[PDB]
Amino acid sequence: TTEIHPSCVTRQKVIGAGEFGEVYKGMLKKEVPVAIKTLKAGYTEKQRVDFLGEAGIMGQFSHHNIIRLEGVISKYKPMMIITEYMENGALDKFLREKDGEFSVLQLVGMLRGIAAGMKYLANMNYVHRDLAARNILVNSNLVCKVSDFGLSRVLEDDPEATYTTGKIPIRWTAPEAISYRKFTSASDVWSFGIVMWEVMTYGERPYWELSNHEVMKAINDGFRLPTPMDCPSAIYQLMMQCWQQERARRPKFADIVSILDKLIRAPDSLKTLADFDPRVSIRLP
Numbered sequence: 001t002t003e004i005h006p007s008c009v010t011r012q013k014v015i016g017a018g019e020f021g022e023v024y025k026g027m028l029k030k031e032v033p034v035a036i037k038t039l040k041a042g043y044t045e046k047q048r049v050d051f052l053g054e055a056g057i058m059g060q061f062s063h064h065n066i067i068r069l070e071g072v073i074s075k076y077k078p079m080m081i082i083t084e085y086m087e088n089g090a091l092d093k094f095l096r097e098k099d100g101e102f103s104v105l106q107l108v109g110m111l112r113g114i115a116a117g118m119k120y121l122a123n124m125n126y127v128h129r130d131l132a133a134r135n136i137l138v139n140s141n142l143v144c145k146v147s148d149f150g151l152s153r154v155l156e157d158d159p160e161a162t163y164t165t166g167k168i169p170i171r172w173t174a175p176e177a178i179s180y181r182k183f184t185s186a187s188d189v190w191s192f193g194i195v196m197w198e199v200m201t202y203g204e205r206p207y208w209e210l211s212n213h214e215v216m217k218a219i220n221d222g223f224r225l226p227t228p229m230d231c232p233s234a235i236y237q238l239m240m241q242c243w244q245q246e247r248a249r250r251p252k253f254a255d256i257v258s259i260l261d262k263l264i265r266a267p268d269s270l271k272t273l274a275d276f277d278p279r280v281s282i283r284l285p
């Protein structure tokens with residue numbers, strides 16, 4: 001990891017705030033825009049290990065679809081992690097604020113980028129455990145990059161992760177991870193299928209208002225999320241295969257990247273849409 005001197009870093013605007021630090025947009029020393037995450041004085045040993053451990057993991061990766069680490073401030077206080085700045089923020093909020101503004105080809109290209117990042121992580125023997133649109137960041141080229149790395153800090157810090165009867169984001173998590181804490185790249189594939197559904201719906205909340213227990217019951221009884229509106233048949237087929245109960249039947253990320261790359265390269269393949277089941281009937285004479 002590159003150790004950066006505090007005098008090179010200018011915090012300009014709070015992007016996010018937590019109990020033990022904040023995330024800032026800033027500039028790094030031509031000066032370059034960066035994101036800056038701080039850890040405030042009084043942090044515990046576990047907080048320090050978790051905080052610097054995220055930078056340690058990120059520093060092991062070099063991929064277009066994985067957030068890039070610029071460096072850390074660890075010699076001075078407060079400590080800081082400095083990354084590239086993703087101008088459009090978190091993917092879930094981004095899509096909700098840009099409803100209907102993109103082509104199907106653009107949406108599928110977002111998914112291919114996410115899948116390539118996840119293929120890299122899985123091959124590097126890194127299991128994400130919290131893959132969801134809220135943990136994807138988007139830059140001004142519309143490139144989607146996987147973020148939120150670490151060990152126990154990932155699910156502990158996510159408000160969507162709730163204590164079950166483990167602390168897990170139920171609607172995004174594979175059955176074996178909910179049931180007996182088996183997190184693997186194949187449970188990340190389940191999550192990727194949910195991310196596919198998030199992207200094609202412009203950020204709808206998975207399973208809408210069903211409670212967590214209701215979601216688990218529905219999944220166990222064989223129900224799956226219905227097709228989004230205006231969704232290519234191939235894309236719905238792919239997300240359905242990500243949601244196979246039997247872990248070993250799910251595609252690997254290599255398969256997902258391959259299929260998405262072929263669909264993008266033959267873009268007419270995306271014009272065949274899966275049927276959408278309406279909830280409203282509008283009848284006019």
Ligand SMILES: Cc1cccc(Cl)c1NC(=O)c1cnc(Nc2cccc(C(=O)N[C@H]3CC[C@](C)(O)CC3)c2)s1
Pocket residue numbers: 015016023035036037054067081082083084085086087088089090093137147148
């Ligand atoms: C991923 C990562 C790990 C460790 C340390 C750092 Cl510094 C980072 N980097 C980042 O968090 C970020 C990189 N680029 C970012 N861009 C960005 C820009 C604008 C908004 C957001 C964003 O998610 N902001 C808010 C969106 C507003 C809300 C919902 O009130 C809270 C979260 C993120 S955040």
